[PDB]
Design a protein around this ligand. Structure first.
Ligand SMILES: *Cc1c(COP(=O)(O)O)cnc(C)c1O
Length: 352
């Protein structure tokens, strides 16, 4: 096939916001929330992309989970002085792209693996993303003014970066809606709180989002097209058609009807749980004394090395483990995650 390597990630103005009190200040989430990881920043400076694959040995995360579960208590936003200069503005926009550094490392690994020539730096990619958002090229007389205008806007986008076999980059920005209450009241809480409610919702005690999950009877073959993210997705598309059948059976609607707020989980040929069609997964386990642990499949299963998965691992919020697909039963709680919507709850509702 003539596939493209694919990266999709949130652009969210609420992640780097002009201070309401002082106009020279932009506010970003508390450093504990790990959006600006120094190690990863240095890895990129050093052209070290393969470190993205390395398992960060152990974590003193836990306690972070307790704190996240009190999302309104976060008052310590990071504050940065931002002038009306292009560099400062590009940096604000960069900080609104969710896990762009991690997306960058993964795309470089995939491109190297598929032997696709590539020489676009992270800073050059950022400029391309900006040109897409403002519909204007660097060097145009209106570039500066259009950057200022776009920055003031509050529209979220799902960004899609596609790299062809010849290394050509195409970018799309797909507008995405916000939950109405968050949209109305975003200005009243910290950026940290906004971030937690938007992207770590799955961890919250009183979350309302809860996708219905199908456990598939059909294994997938692990391949380069599962371990990496690309447009060659016939295997996931088949799973999603089967998800549709199962969810419609469950909900009592015609098998051909559209379905939403649902996901399908599948195993590899050895029967180990891999991932969902559009998310990585963590299953909820317990140990005495009944404390929850969130356990996510290892990359050895063939699942995608998701950026949201990587983020949650380095924060210590999930941990790797081996889960037999046969262990999931109706009623089981899971977490589902990707770099667009972050982490949400799901519940196993049917098997098919
Ligand atoms: C997008 C996707 C994920 C999640 O990857 P992120 O980098 O977190 O967005 C997981 N599995 C599959 C099959 C996907 O397409």
């Amino acid at each position: 096939p003539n596939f493209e390597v694919l990266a999709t990630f949130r652009y969210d103005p609420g992640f780097a916001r002009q201070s309401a009190s002082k106009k020279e200040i932009f506010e970003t989430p508390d450093p504990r929330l790990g959006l600006r990881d120094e190690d990863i920043r240095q890895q990129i400076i050093n052209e070290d992309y393969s470190s993205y694959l390395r398992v960060r040995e152990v974590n003193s995360g836990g306690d972070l989970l307790e704190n996240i579960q009190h999302p309104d208590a976060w008052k310590h936003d990071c504050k940065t002085i931002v002038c009306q200069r292009v560099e400062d503005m590009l940096q604000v926009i960069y900080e609104r792209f969710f896990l762009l550094d991690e997306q960058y490392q993964r795309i470089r690994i995939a491109l190297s693996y598929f032997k696709i020539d590539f020489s676009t730096s992270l800073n050059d990619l950022l400029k391309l993303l900006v040109e897409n958002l403002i519909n204007c090229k660097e060097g145009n007389s209106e570039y500066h003014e259009k950057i200022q205008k776009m920055i003031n806007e509050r529209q979220c986008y799902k960004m899609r970066v596609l790299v062809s076999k010849t290394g050509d980059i195409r970018i799309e920005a797909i507008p995405m809606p916000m939950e109405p209450i968050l949209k109305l009241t975003t200005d009243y809480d910290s950026v940290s709180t906004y971030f937690i409610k938007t992207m770590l919702n799955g961890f919250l005690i009183d979350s309302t989002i809860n996708w219905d999950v199908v456990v598939s009877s059909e294994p997938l073959n692990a391949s380069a097209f599962t371990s990496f993210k690309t447009t060659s997705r016939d295997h996931y598309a088949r799973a999603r058609v089967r998800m549709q059948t199962a969810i419609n059976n469950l909900r009592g609607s015609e098998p051909t009807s559209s379905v939403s707020q649902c996901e399908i989980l599948f195993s590899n040929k050895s029967g180990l749980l891999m991932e969902g069609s559009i998310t990585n997964v963590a299953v909820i386990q317990k140990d005495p004394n009944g404390s929850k642990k969130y356990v996510t499949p290892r990359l050895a299963t063939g699942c995608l090395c998701g950026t949201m998965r990587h983020y949650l691992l380095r924060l210590g919020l999930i941990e790797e483990g081996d889960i037999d697909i046969g262990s999931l039963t109706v009623g089981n709680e899971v977490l589902l995650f990707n770099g667009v919507m972050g982490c949400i709850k799901g519940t196993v509702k049917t098997k098919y």
